[PDB]
Amino acid sequence: EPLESQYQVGPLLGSGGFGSVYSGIRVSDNLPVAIKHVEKDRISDWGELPNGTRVPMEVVLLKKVSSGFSGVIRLLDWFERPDSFVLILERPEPVQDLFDFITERGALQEELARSFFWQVLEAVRHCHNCGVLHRDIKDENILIDLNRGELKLIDFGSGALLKDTVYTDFDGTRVYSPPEWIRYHRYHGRSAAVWSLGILLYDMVCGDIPFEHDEEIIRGQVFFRQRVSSECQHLIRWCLALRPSDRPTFEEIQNHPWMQDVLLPQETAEIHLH
């Protein structure tokens, strides 16, 4: 009931702008959890709980996306403390961050990249159905459940409620930010999400990001360092259309020729992860 009696705390999993995440175990059912600490001092994204109380946007957003669809990590609980917020999140076991998976394996085979991409497409589509906008889609914010071959979207610390009017604030990662942001500091949610999705696909199949500097983004020319299929190249260059309204919708991305005949997660695991 207190807090540190209900969860067997463990070793640091990582830390950065999101805060400090620790491996953990819920005492009782021995459920594997992740305990995320973030201090009020450095919280930039604040939100309002359904019942008034002021709270880290992440709590607001995870609450809006909690249920049976396991494409986004589940918030199991949360606590306020005098100077910080603590979040209890699910923890697949074994697990691996997409960034580390790609770092140690290089460019992914298209079949595997297809399976993964599809899964993050289903998970962003879910977030949007719940009025949630992630704003920081990238390899680091995606976990892999190595047993099931299921991806989980994580880290909603830069998200926002989904809206159809313009955004004038951006907290997410720069090299993942669309030409609209760089040039005008204005963007719309869906089309910006699609841009970052295009960066993600490229990263998956090439092993690295397509653009390093602002001028590279504004130019939007995509050079391919590795061998990549023609359909995949066309989907990538589409998501990375300079004009936002030129970018495909989620339905359009999922109906794209490259996106056909996706493996189910468990097949993915047996052929590519086991």
Ligand SMILES: Cc1cc(C2=NC(=O)N=C(c3ccccc3)C2)ccc1O
């Ligand atoms: C294993 C696990 C990790 C996380 C992370 N949450 C986060 O906000 N940020 C994370 C992160 C850590 C290091 C590098 C990049 C992201 C990880 C949430 C639930 C989990 O079960």
